[PDB]
Amino acid sequence: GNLFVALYDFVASGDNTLSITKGEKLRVLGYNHNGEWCEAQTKNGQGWVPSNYITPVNSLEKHSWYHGPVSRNAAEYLLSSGINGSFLVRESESSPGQRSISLRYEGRVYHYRINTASDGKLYVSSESRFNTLAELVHHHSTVADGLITTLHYPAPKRNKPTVYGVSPNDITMKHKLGGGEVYEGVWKKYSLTVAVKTLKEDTMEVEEFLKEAAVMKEIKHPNLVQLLGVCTREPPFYIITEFMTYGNLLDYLRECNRQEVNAVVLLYMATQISSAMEYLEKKNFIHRDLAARNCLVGENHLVKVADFGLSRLMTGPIKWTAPESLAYNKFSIKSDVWAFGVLLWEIATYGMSPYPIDLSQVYELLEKDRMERPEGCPEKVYELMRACWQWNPSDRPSFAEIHQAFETMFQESSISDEVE
Ligand SMILES: O=C(Nc1ccc(OC(F)(F)Cl)cc1)c1cnc(N2CC[C@@H](O)C2)c(-c2ccn[nH]2)c1
Ligand SMILES: COc1cc2ncnc(Nc3ccc(Oc4ccccc4)cc3)c2cc1OC
Ligand SMILES: [Cl-]
Numbered sequence: 001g002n003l004f005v006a007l008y009d010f011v012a013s014g015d016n017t018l019s020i021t022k023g024e025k026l027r028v029l030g031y032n033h034n035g036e037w038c039e040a041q042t043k044n045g046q047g048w049v050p051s052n053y054i055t056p057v058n059s060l061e062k063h064s065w066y067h068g069p070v071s072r073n074a075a076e077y078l079l080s081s082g083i084n085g086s087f088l089v090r091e092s093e094s095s096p097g098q099r100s101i102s103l104r105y106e107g108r109v110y111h112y113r114i115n116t117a118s119d120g121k122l123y124v125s126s127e128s129r130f131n132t133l134a135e136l137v138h139h140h141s142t143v144a145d146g147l148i149t150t151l152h153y154p155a156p157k158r159n160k161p162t163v164y165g166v167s168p169n170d171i172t173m174k175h176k177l178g179g180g181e182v183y184e185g186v187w188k189k190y191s192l193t194v195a196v197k198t199l200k201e202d203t204m205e206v207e208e209f210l211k212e213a214a215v216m217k218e219i220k221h222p223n224l225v226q227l228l229g230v231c232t233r234e235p236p237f238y239i240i241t242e243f244m245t246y247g248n249l250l251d252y253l254r255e256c257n258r259q260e261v262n263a264v265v266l267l268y269m270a271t272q273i274s275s276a277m278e279y280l281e282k283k284n285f286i287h288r289d290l291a292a293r294n295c296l297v298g299e300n301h302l303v304k305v306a307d308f309g310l311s312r313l314m315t316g317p318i319k320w321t322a323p324e325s326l327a328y329n330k331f332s333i334k335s336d337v338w339a340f341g342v343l344l345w346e347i348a349t350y351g352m353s354p355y356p357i358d359l360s361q362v363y364e365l366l367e368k369d370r371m372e373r374p375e376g377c378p379e380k381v382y383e384l385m386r387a388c389w390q391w392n393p394s395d396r397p398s399f400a401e402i403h404q405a406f407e408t409m410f411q412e413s414s415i416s417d418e419v420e
Contacts, residue, residue, distance in 0.1 A: 018047025052161035085152025223276035290339035334393030341388025
């Protein structure tokens with residue numbers, strides 16, 4: 001009804017950004033070039049606001065139980081911390097317009113489809129159809145009516161929506177890491193915590209460091225780290241990226257509390273990384289340094305991938321390479337598929353050192369037959385990483401194929417159930 005409602009809290013602290021509290025009423029006056037920001041007027045003032053942080057009043061997103069387009073296993077992770085009656089309504093990522101209800105009950109997560117009849121009345125069971133989705137959700141929150149339990153408690157959001165650009169349109173240096181290249185720091189103009197990477201050369205050339213970053217600036221995916229800025233005017237070049245509070249994926253995995261980080265969490269991270277790699281491959285970009293250290297962990301196990309196009313740097317890296325990448329200097333997605341298979345072995349092993357096996361002869365060890373089953377790794381997952389390690393690179397599945405497998409691997413089961 002011409003009005004908008006804020007879905008997430010946003011602190012302004014920006015050029016002309018407007019602070020919004022969840023549930024505030026907004027009148028939208030316009031949008032910026034990319035649409036990631038929109039000018040809004042509220043009872044307090046006028047200013048720019050992230051577009052994904054607010055939704056139209058007539059929108060179905062105004063409801064808490066509607067999480068928009070959500071992966072099936074992402075929804076399963078969302079319901080992992082729930083109780084009986086915990087539920088969410090999601091849009092199918094593979095085919096949009098298809099709606100599903102994910103409902104948690106006694107440790108299980110059940111998925112139901114909201115099918116539309118010839119009348120257009122959406123329904124879950126054929127005996128009760130409704131004109132609108134809100135009617136159906138209200139009815140199934142009143143009685144179960146064919147569901148295993150009533151839709152009682154909408155699931156909370158996993159993370160705030162990702163925005164591209166700190167503004168609609170060198171600086172403070174904090175502590176580095178501790179040791180045992182990348183520093184944490186503050187941007188004053190927007191007063192936000194960022195990560196700054198310094199570098200020397202070899203891969204970081206004179207004109208490549210600027211023309212390559214232009215392609216990197218166009219890297220925009222929820223599971224890919226965002227290149228906020230670059231500073232090439234000083235002998236130490238600065239790479240400004242988002243900040244992830246939990247840091248290294250390998251360090252997280254080795255120190256994590258496995259009761260909180262269970263098999264569903266592991267598949268959530270794997271699906272995130274696979275979707276990031278699918279986005280990178282579909283754009284014809286090669287990561288080249290895929291591994292656990294180059295991934296980062298965020299809130300609610302939000303995983304992002306960094307160090308893409310980095311190739312060199314840090315280095316204080318043999319086992320994550322393709323057999324054809326170090327023998328003949330290959331540049332391909334399939335090498336990244338091999339690195340992804342090693343990464344998934346690491347995830348299945350909770351961060352164990354790969355090939356645990358003489359390094360000085362590992363190449364040969366591969367000319368004939370690869371790591372064995374981790375304890376509890378489902379045979380499907382080992383099969384996937386097995387395909388990811390092929391002597392001929394053409395025989396390895398695409399990252400899109402890997403993601404499609406991952407989503408449909410446990411359609412009639414649970415990864416927690418299929419541990420053994
Ligand atoms: O959950 C586990 N694996 C998993 C989860 C999700 C997967 O799918 C994906 F998609 F997420 Cl990769 C794939 C694998 C798991 C549980 N327990 C384990 N332990 C055995 C020794 C004991 O102390 C603890 C191990 C293990 C074996 C070797 N090291 N660790 C693994
Ligand atoms: C809490 O601990 C950490 C938090 C982090 N938060 C964000 N980023 C990190 N690492 C990073 C930063 C910039 C960078 O530069 C590039 C970015 C993309 C592509 C190429 C280069 C590479 C890695 C972090 C590292 C951390 O400890 C290892
Ligand atoms: Cl929306």
